[PDB]
Design a protein around this ligand. Structure first.
Ligand SMILES: *[C@](O)(C(=O)NC1CC1)[C@H](C[C@@H]1CCNC1=O)NC(=O)[C@H](CC1CC1)n1cccc(NC(=O)OC(C)(C)C)c1=O
Ligand SMILES: *[C@](O)(C(=O)NC1CC1)[C@H](C[C@@H]1CCNC1=O)NC(=O)[C@H](CC1CC1)n1cccc(NC(=O)OC(C)(C)C)c1=O
Ligand SMILES: [Cl-]
Lengths: 305, 304
């Protein structure tokens, strides 16, 4: 009973957060086995940030220029390399709190938990989606760089995001853990703009199913729609196209509620055309698009880690 | 920048969660030093639940009847006692991951993080406010009983909530860690219902300050209101009276933004009377009342 934006328990990731210092710049690192991952811009001065030549700045660094701190303990750096926009610091000590893990690159619309950290100390946890324009709507201040985003599958932590920068209107950009940016962004202090964002239609439908599971039924209408007729209306309201793959993915939620996906689409089409008329769904006055179908099943069925 | 509903990092609490089984009832316990804390209704069959005589039921139990599992390890129960609605199981092993901690009783309008657990395994974390009607708007399924709520202050975990029950309207009730219910609720199967709730005025103002700090400022106006004139309008909308103590508690946010509390109250009065006319504040189409002034300061100033 009840429905909440819910993060993964952060304990497995908290035990991996360290502080990385290079001269005057301090940010967060992820310590897995004997490697610390962090944003490469830890090596820049504010001067360098405008247009850094990262390969050139790193040549000028030595193992000893990297101060890595895990609580009270300094970790000795015995090697360093750059992969894309991340620095990999080889340390002489493997993290005893290393969980089972993998690095994954997520798709727009997929959700993940962020452990917000400052000076290598976990400060807060919240749930985000990769927006269709490859930004995230985060909460990050100066010091938060190297904070990571993740999912848990049972006891396996999938790292999908590392935080690098803030874009116009207070949205955020970062990389996967191989250091490749999500979206066309670069780690430089330079005018950059995200594309126009859109609503994650498959997620809105997942959340209408969550609504029915939780006893909110008012928006259910007597109609069905074709996928074509649905997309004609959705594109008019800056919704992502709904694919057959999306219809097929909503199948289990459809079976749970006895409401055909295209009947739920006809209900969404009416909400977009008519609005909600001052009414709420699951305590929201707008349609929520940061719950995946898996997130809804997770929460409504209580899967654990 | 940016502003999100944010929970505390849950790791210190995850290291305390165990499974407690008595007969066919499995729920969650909190393992601190050599004591496991859980809801006393772990001892009931649904038979027992109409008016359970917990004192009698507990006398009839053996330590052996309490199966306590911490991951792969069974903890030997060597004693049991009841404090209010909480069962205390003495175990032969002190939890080595016991954090620095306190038991606190929170006030209506204050917030805390919930670690939702099933079978002693953490499932998710989210933020809740203790509502003025002593309920919480949580997300809890069968097996969630014994999940706890907490705040972290530096390295100290303040445990404030243990989950016992769901109410009509999809809201939740539970106890502090001494087993005293928040609100007039009782741990038995008897029809029960929350009082009428009210909106936490000081929290809505905190959140409007969070919006301004983040550059969401369309709702600001050149007008001011007296405290009385504010309370005359807002109380018609079922808002808590704004007191001078509330005005003082907002002092840091008022000083940070340079917007006097009674300046900001003229915004809120206009939002209540006219609505948002299709706009959002921090991506919400409604006024949010589950952020305390401390929550906004914490998040906008990055305390760790
Ligand atoms: C990150 O480097 C960090 O936390 N550094 C530690 C102190 C040493 C920050 C995190 C951001 C600060 C505010 N919010 C954030 O998310 N990242 C940066 O400062 C960026 C580094 C560059 C990519 C390499 N960064 C630098 C300069 C400007 C900006 N953004 C910016 O000006 O945003 C506008 C105003 C929207 C254009 C930036 O993100
Ligand atoms: C709790 O005891 C639990 O998780 N037990 C473990 C499975 C063995 C549950 C938690 C709730 C189940 C669904 N969501 C929850 O939050 N708590 C209870 O079942 C209550 C136990 C009583 C306090 C001692 N409880 C018992 C009977 C009825 C109800 N509520 C109820 O019927 O609510 C309606 C359906 C909204 C009227 C209840 O919460
Ligand atoms: Cl809303």
């Amino acid at each position: 009973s009840g429905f909440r934006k819910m993060a993964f328990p952060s304990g497995k990731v908290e035990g991996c957060m360290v502080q990385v210092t290079c001269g005057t710049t301090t940010l967060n690192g992820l310590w897995l086995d004997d490697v610390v991952y962090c944003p490469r811009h830890v090596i820049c001065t504010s001067e360098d940030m405008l247009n850094p030549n990262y390969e050139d700045l790193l040549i000028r660094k030595s193992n000893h220029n990297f101060l890595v701190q895990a609580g009270n303990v300094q970790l000795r750096v015995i090697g360093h390399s750059m992969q894309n926009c991340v620095l990999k610091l080889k340390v002489d000590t493997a993290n005893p709190k290393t969980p089972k893990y993998k690095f994954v690159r997520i798709q727009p619309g997929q959700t993940f938990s962020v452990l917000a950290c400052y000076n290598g100390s976990p400060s807060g946890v919240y749930q985000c989606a990769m927006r269709p324009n490859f930004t995230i709507k985060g909460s990050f201040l100066n010091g938060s760089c190297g904070s990571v985003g993740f999912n848990i599958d049972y006891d396996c932590v999938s790292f999908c995001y590392m935080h690098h920068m803030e874009l116009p209107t207070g949205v955020h950009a970062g990389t996967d853990l191989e250091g490749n940016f999500y979206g066309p962004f670069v780690d430089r202090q330079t005018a950059q703009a995200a594309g126009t964002d859109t609503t994650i239609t498959v997620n809105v439908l997942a959340w209408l199913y969550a609504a029915v599971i939780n006893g909110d039924r008012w928006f259910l209408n007597r109609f069905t729609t074709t996928l074509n007729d649905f997309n004609l209306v959705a594109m008019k309201y800056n919704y992502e196209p709904l694919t057959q793959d999306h219809v097929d993915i909503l199948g289990p939620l459809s079976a749970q509620t006895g409401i055909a996906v295209l009947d739920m689409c006809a209900s969404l089409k009416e909400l977009l055309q008519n609005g909600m008329n001052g009414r709420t769904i699951l305590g929201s006055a707008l349609l929520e698009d940061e719950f995946t179908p898996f997130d809804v099943v997770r929460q409504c069925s209580g899967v654990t880690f």
